[PDB]
Design a protein that fits this description.
This is part of a larger assembly, with chains A (185 residues) and B (51 residues). By secondary structure, chain A is an alpha+beta fold. Chain A contains five helices and five strands, in the order αββββαααβα. Chain A has one domain (2-184): Butyryl-CoA Dehydrogenase, subunit A, domain 3 (Up-down Bundle), CATH 1.20.140. The longest helix of chain A has 37 residues, at 148-184. The two termini of chain A are 24 Å apart. Chain B has 51 residues and is an all-alpha fold. Helices cover 25% and strands 0% of the residues of chain B. Chain B has one helix at 38-50. The radius of gyration of chain B is 27 Å and the shape is rod-shaped. Classes of the chains: A alpha+beta (185), B mainly alpha (51). Chains A and B meet through loops of A and loops of B. It is classed as membrane protein. The entry lists the keywords ampar, ion channels, neurotransmission, membrane protein. Resting state full-length GluA1/A2 heterotertramer in complex with TARP gamma 8 and CNIH2.
């Protein structure tokens, strides 16, 4: 029913926000080999901001990533700011807030719509951030791999799209109920 | 040559240009249009409009 769908939507919003914040803050996106590891290089696990060496003399020390051709410059800027994943998390938060409001202003039906739009836009922004990250990593030192933070981001995207679908369905049902009641009245 | 005497050159040369070897360029955004010239793409657009 409507109540269970709203409950799932709010749970998904909270879960996606948490997963994306975890992925952004976490530094386990990429497992690779880097020259700056104190001995082609040493194993490293990285993220969006900082990189940590593992299995090396400098084991456990984490250092801020040293980023840095107009398009390459723009890509480096966007990758450094990580504005797209952050925007995804922000939009998920705002959508959850709008859903909670929809749990109060049951009359205003154009709220659970904003929630869905924001969730879908957050999914798109996460896609863009993933593309930017993958593109920027490449350059022109092998057998690299992706960590659980990357898949947390992917899970956040999937959940955001699902809850956007559910919110749009809720809006559909609510508007249909109101319109049928009015016309029949 | 005013103070010594040379032989005929045993090796002739001249000024030349040294550059770094062109590398596989990092693929550019919108490199998927490279197979066709820009003029073909614009003619495609306007043929779409006209059709």
């Amino acid at each position: 029913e409507k109540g269970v769908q709203v409950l799932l939507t709010t749970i998904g919003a909270f879960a996606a926000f948490g997963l994306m914040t975890i992925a952004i803050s976490t530094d386990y996106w990429l497992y690779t080999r880097a020259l700056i590891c104190n001995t082609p290089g040493g194993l490293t696990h990285s993220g969006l901001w900082r990189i940590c060496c593992l299995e090396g003399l400098k084991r456990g020390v984490c250092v801020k990533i040293n980023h840095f051709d107009s398009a390459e410059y723009l890509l480096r800027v966007v990758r450094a700011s990580s504005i797209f994943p952050i925007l995804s998390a922000i939009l998920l938060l705002l959508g959850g807030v709008c859903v909670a409001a929809s749990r109060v202003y049951k009359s205003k039906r154009n709220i659970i719509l904003g929630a869905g739009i924001l969730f879908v836009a957050a999914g798109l922004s996460n896609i863009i951030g993933v593309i930017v990250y993958i593109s920027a990593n490449a350059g022109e030192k092998n057998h690299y791999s992706y960590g659980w933070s990357f898949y947390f981001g992917g899970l956040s995207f999937i959940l955001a799209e699902v809850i956007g679908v559910l919110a749009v369905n809720i809006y559909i049902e609510r508007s249909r109920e109101a319109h049928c009641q009015s016309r029949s009245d | 040559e005013e103070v010594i005497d040379f032989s005929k050159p045993f090796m002739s040369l001249g000024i030349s240009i040294m550059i770094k070897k062109p590398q596989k360029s990092k693929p550019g955004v919108f490199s998927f249009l490279d197979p066709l010239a820009y003029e073909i793409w614009m003619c495609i657009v306007f043929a779409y409009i006209g059709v």
